[PDB]
Curated annotation (Swiss-Prot), chains A, B:
The keyword Lyase applies. Homodimer. It holds the Pfam family Aminotran_1_2. This is Threonine-phosphate decarboxylase. It comes from the Bacteria.
Amino acid sequence: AHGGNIREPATVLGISPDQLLDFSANINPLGMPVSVKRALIDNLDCIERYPDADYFHLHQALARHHQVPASWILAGNGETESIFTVASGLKPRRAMIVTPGFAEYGRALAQSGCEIRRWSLREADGWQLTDAILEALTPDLDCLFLCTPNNPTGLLPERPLLQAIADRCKSLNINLILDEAFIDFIPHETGFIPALKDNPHIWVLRSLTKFYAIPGLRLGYLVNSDDAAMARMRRQQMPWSVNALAALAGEVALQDSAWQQATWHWLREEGARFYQALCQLPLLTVYPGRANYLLLRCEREDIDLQRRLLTQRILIRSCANYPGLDSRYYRVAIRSAAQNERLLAALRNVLTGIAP
Amino acid sequence: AHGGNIREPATVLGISPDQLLDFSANINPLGMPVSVKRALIDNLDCIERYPDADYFHLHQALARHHQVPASWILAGNGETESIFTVASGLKPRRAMIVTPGFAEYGRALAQSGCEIRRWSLREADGWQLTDAILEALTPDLDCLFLCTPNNPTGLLPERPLLQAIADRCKSLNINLILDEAFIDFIPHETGFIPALKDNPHIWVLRSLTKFYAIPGLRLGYLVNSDDAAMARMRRQQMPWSVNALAALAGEVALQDSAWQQATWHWLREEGARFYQALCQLPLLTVYPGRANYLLLRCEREDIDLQRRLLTQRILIRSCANYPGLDSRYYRVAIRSAAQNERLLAALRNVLTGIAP
Ligand SMILES: Cc1ncc(COP(=O)(O)O)c(CNC[C@@H](C)OP(=O)(O)O)c1O
Ligand SMILES: Cc1ncc(COP(=O)(O)O)c(CNC[C@@H](C)OP(=O)(O)O)c1O
């Protein structure tokens, strides 16, 4: 049960989803780039033909964007498909995931028949990934999934720690899958694509749906420099999985040279202002997320924050279904100032004026 | 290597794909319904949110269309996804497919770890499915895939034979998967959805991409009346696989009450006129396909028809890669009269004036 389920949320209340303000999914509040919408409208008739099965133009655009060989890239029907593709293409016998984390890594691995080991983040560490994981990495592991920054904490592990993990993985023959779905939101963070050349054991997952606001179109991709392994992924993949409009949108989106700075500026300004306001609320712990969402811990047990905000027609993410987190945890997106203010006001009604 | 690969075909020639006339994919020549295009343009901003994970409106529309419980239906990112979903959801140990047939059944089963048995259609039978298959059906089979009408022959097995197969399957505990991807083109053919109520061993695959001309959007679905099995399919399925525009397009498409009659009329008129003209060509055998495509057998060995037509900038499907068919076999779509005439003229240049 993932976030962004507004139709389901509205159904629970008996109202139309157009009446809900959603903070349970984390999509760039700027909306899709104007050029993207124009291109979609202008080329809509392209849907009367099958997509290019090899997605030449799309992969060329992604390759030019990251300055890597097009052969290192495989686009997917959302990064969600890329996660299932890597799991099925690598068919690990034993794999480690880090909890709490995005639920699909586990679903994908389970379906592929893998023995899943969980590395548990600790509330006492403020949910930060630590070097304690290194000693937990063993030769018998085939894969390790890390999310950078993590869903739902928004925390980004230190580059040196990620490098230490990557190096250990290289020596223990472990494939390292880095989920960089939200990395574009963190100013100046390059991720690991610039370092794949001499590290064929590293796989990077990317998504265009949150940063460019096209989650309804579905577009993500996987990058890796092992010629043979990527070739195998191209087969284990279902044909025409990426729709023609997603491919077009992706190409156009990457051409908007102002999008990145505009998004970073918003995060640095409103995002910082929103975070400060949340931290001024009583009976609430707010974690220092680096992208467009924040993990919250409600210090009032006798209060289902999600149920309470839903009656106020504001949908938030309940993190109780993440392994490792309990009913006190929730996640909210960072949106436009006006919407953020409505969220804040709702939270105050449930948090201010209450004794410990 | 499926048909519709115009970008790849154009690349082989060193030209732009906009210069090719494609007869290698079989899409309704009328294009997408006008209401569908209007709805897509009017609701394009819906892509700024994730699709409804449960696709309520879409499944409700499909259920109303077939007058069956919405619980019997699962939409997919093209019927291609539905094929992979049924294979993975049923995880057959032994399964039978009929050759020649669409390549994805075999790919899907192979990936799921199934022992595949092939029932071979015979050139001496004019590639018709016969009752000889019944004795080949055994208790140890878990699944049987039939395509009605078949890709690439366009032949539709007799209802009584399909019923006999279905009944035998029911008694031998075999799941029967009927690929009805092209059934909408055959006037008055209802398929098996109207008969699923008391046959939970029957699974029907449907596609909206050829009949409504949205192969670039990707939309198909699976129907079955076994409560538990469909429930399992809803899990083995990847979340948000159907994009928001495909779901919208599907709902709108089903509301066009003139589309069906218009398409049937075209097939009965131009389709019949095209078929007759093909049959007047020398050194060519044309099979009696019932939908919008026809299988051709070139009686001139020393002539690669596809290569020869490609130089004339017309792309056709070579069926040499179908198990059971050799280099003499090709398939062509049935399109508009003008385009059909260009195809005919090209064929004449390669077939007329030549001695046996
Ligand atoms: C870390 C992470 N990785 C990959 C994806 C897949 O993205 P896409 O397929 O659109 O490219 C998501 C989406 N997450 C969407 C969100 C609604 O799910 P939760 O409430 O469980 O966080 C994600 O959060
Ligand atoms: C029998 C059959 N079933 C299912 C599909 C999948 O349809 P979709 O995913 O668009 O709903 C196709 C598509 N076939 C497309 C065609 C180009 O492939 P070939 O040249 O191998 O025949 C098909 O021919």
